[PDB]
């Protein structure tokens, strides 16, 4: 099998996406490679939603390899949703050619989440148990057909440029320092594991007694249960403005605390610079509440600090300090 490097483009530190090619001849799309879902879909000619109007739409009639499947697709995300119809076609991801791959063609993309997204579609990278009926995840096909060198992939999110990278089938040591640390997956659906505590200077501020978290490339922020998140916002000095936005005084950055996630026996600090979005002197919090869920989401805020490896052979997540 082979290793494939898939360069990722960063849009506003909030979404990281790459190019795939679908059909014969290839129709090009940008997709968010999403470790928090398992379905692969792109917009199509059958969608008249606003989001479909300002993105690339797949035309199955122009593809000689397209085979319709007939089955419906419906996906709800934390932000946004889609309906569509499943089919089969060849998708190429870097140097890996994935024939007869199930792919959703959108018919509805309601609301503006996807209207204002830079990517066209989503390529999910989680477990088959999270996939819709009749939908086989792309990476599972790649493993089952022996197209990749190893049953793992790795994600680097560049803090200081556009060198972000998804590596299929390998880890790249140029993206981290120190040692890789392995964390067992608890529930095989999302890339989920146990966090033992969240502390500031040895004092527990959140996740008292342990909690579940997922590692999700497709979530921009660090999301947690609302009461725990509110405790963190208070500790770091993030204050809600009249519009509901949690603002941070930029001049406090060198005088603010580090928030530490204890994960399988190793500490994962987030410095003020790591958790604070800094926009030309205007600063906001990278922590976000979720309504009633209690499952944490370690999104791009976290992954920028920790090079992330997703190992399907052994059901592990790997973390290392990013370069």
């Amino acid at each position: 099998g082979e290793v494939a490097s898939v360069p990722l483009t960063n849009y506003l530190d909030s979404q990281y996406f790459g190019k795939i090619y679908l059909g014969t001849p290839p129709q090009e799309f940008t997709v968010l490679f999403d470790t928090g879902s398992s379905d692969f879909w792109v917009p199509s000619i059958y969608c008249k939603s606003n989001a479909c109007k300002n993105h690339q739409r797949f035309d199955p009639r122009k593809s000689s390899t397209f085979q319709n499947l007939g089955k419906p697709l419906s996906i709800h995300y934390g932000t946004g949703s889609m309906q569509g119809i499943l089919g089969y076609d060849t998708v190429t991801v870097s140097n890996i050619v994935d024939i007869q791959q199930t792919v959703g063609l959108s018919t509805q993309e309601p609301g503006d989440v996807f209207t204002y997204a830079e990517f066209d579609g989503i390529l999910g990278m989680a477990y088959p148990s999270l996939a819709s009926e009749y939908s086989i995840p792309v990476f599972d096909n790649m493993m089952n057909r022996h197209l990749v060198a190893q049953d793992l992939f790795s994600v680097y999110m560049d803090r200081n440029g556009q060198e972000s990278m998804l590596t299929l089938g390998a880890i790249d040591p140029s993206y981290y320092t120190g040692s890789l640390h392995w964390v067992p997956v608890t529930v095989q659906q999302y890339w989920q594991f146990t966090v033992d505590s969240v502390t500031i200077s040895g004092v527990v501020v959140a996740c008292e007694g342990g909690c579940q978290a997922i590692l999700d490339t497709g979530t921009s922020k660090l999301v947690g249960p609302s009461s725990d998140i509110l405790n963190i916002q208070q500790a770091i000095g993030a204050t809600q403005n009249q519009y509901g936005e949690f603002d941070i005084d930029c001049d406090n950055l060198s005088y603010m605390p580090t928030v530490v996630f204890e994960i399988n026996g190793k500490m994962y600090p987030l410095t003020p610079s790591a958790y604070t979005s800094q926009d030309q002197g205007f600063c906001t919090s990278g922590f976000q509440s979720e309504n009633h869920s209690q499952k944490w989401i370690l999104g791009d805020v976290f992954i920028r600090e920790y090079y992330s490896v997703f190992d399907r052979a052994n059901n592990l997540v790997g973390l290392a300090k990013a370069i």
Binding site: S14, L32, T35, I75, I122, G218, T219, K221
Partner: peptide
């Protein structure tokens, strides 16, 4: 932001 599946 986005928060990607239910």
């Amino acid at each position: 932001x986005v928060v990607x599946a239910x």
